[PDB]
Amino acid sequence: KARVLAEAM
Amino acid sequence: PQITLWKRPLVTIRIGGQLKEALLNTGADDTVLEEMNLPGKWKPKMIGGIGGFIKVRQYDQIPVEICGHKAIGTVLVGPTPVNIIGRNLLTQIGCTLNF
Amino acid sequence: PQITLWKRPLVTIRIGGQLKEALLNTGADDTVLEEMNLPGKWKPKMIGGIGGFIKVRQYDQIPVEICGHKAIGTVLVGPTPVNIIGRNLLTQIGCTLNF
């Protein structure tokens, strides 16, 4: 499964 | 170009005559764009991230222009909080991480 | 070094006498590591991505050696799918995107 790890607090 | 990371690496991309702002994301395997109507057939897919999974629409062979650089590949469309350019497209424009 | 993106950009990091594998992620503002114990006082924080928000523990001023380069900054710990090194530490080791 693919991962799109955008992240912000 | 050389892009520093003091701020989010947002760039301009062109697709279907529409110019949008997208995040250069080395942490994304695929490219995910905010809801938009692309012509052609597509298939349902689930992609995961930090807070779980979301359902998206997968379109193939979509021409995309990233900062003057031309690329062609898969594009996923779904409810993403931000437009994301993934490794599938970044590799096509010879993008690397350097330190 | 120069890292291409045909494969996930995973590197070995050293933190608290422990070796772990992490992904250099230009799409993340912060650095988030899977559950683990670290010294000092930590405070609850919430972060979001695709899929939603999750709760994490924040540890400040933590020494992290990334592929040989030293950094000292904030490290979040929680249920992240993969260990990720975000922009807060990428900037400290002078990492940039190039194409």
> Any idea where the domains of chain B sit in the sequence?
1-99
Structure determination method? X-ray
Q: Does domain C1-99 have CATH number 2.40.70.10?
A: yes
Give the chains touching C; criterion: ≥3 Cβ pairs < 8 Å: A, B
Angular region, B27: left φ>0, alpha ψ -120 to 50, beta rest: alpha
For residue C66, what are the β-bridge partners? Answer: C13, C69
Q: Do B30 and A1 touch (CB under 8 A)?
A: no
State phi, psi for B92 to the nearest 5 degrees: -65, -25
Q: Does A1 touch chain B if contact means CB atoms closer than 8 Å?
A: yes
Helix (H) or strand (E) holding B98: strand B96-98
Token pair recorded at residue C60: 């400040």
Using the structure block, give the residue that is written with the tokens 């899977």: C34
Token pair recorded at residue C4: 């291409």
